[PDB]
C-alpha cells in the first residue's frame, strides 16, 4: 500500500487506514 | 518520507521509525 503518516488530515484521494506512533506522537495513517 | 508498515522486519537500508496500527494489528514503520 502507499501510505503517509500525516500530522494533518488525509489528502484528496486518501483514506484513513489507521494511525502511526512516531516519537511519542500520534499521526493519521493516510493511504491510497 | 517514504515508509512502509511492515508485517516483517525492516530491510537492511531502512530505518525503523515508529509503529503503524492498522485494523487491530501493529506493524513496524520502516522508512527509506
UniProtKB/Swiss-Prot annotation, chains A, B:
Known outcome of mutating residue 30 to S: Prohibits tetramer formation
Outcome recorded upon mutating residue 28 to A: Does not disrupt homodimer-formation. Reduced enhancement of S.flexneri infection. Impairs antimicrobial activity against E.coli, E.aerogenes, S.aureus and B.cereus. Reduced induction of IL-8 secretion
Result for mutant: residue 9 to A: Reduced killing of S.aureus and E.coli. Impairs antimicrobial activity against E.coli, E.aerogenes, S.aureus and B.cereus. Reduced induction of IL-8 secretion
Outcome after substituting residue 21 to R: Enhanced antibacterial activity against both E.coli and S.aureus. Disrupts homodimerization. Enhanced membrane binding and membrane disintegration abilities, as well further increased antibacterial activity
UniProt effect for mutating residue 26 to A: Reduced interaction with B.antracis lef/lethal factor. Reduced enhancement of S.flexneri infection
Residue intervals passing through the bilayer: none
Known outcome of mutating residue 15 to A: Increased interaction with B.antracis lef/lethal factor
Protein name: HD5(63-94)
Gene: DEFA5
Full protein: residues contained: 63 to 94 of 94
Amino acid at each position: 500500500a502507499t501510505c503517509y503518516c500525516r500530522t494533518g488530515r488525509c489528502a484528496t484521494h486518501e483514506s484513513l487506514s489507521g494511525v502511526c506512533e512516531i516519537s511519542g506522537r500520534l499521526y493519521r495513517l493516510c493511504c491510497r
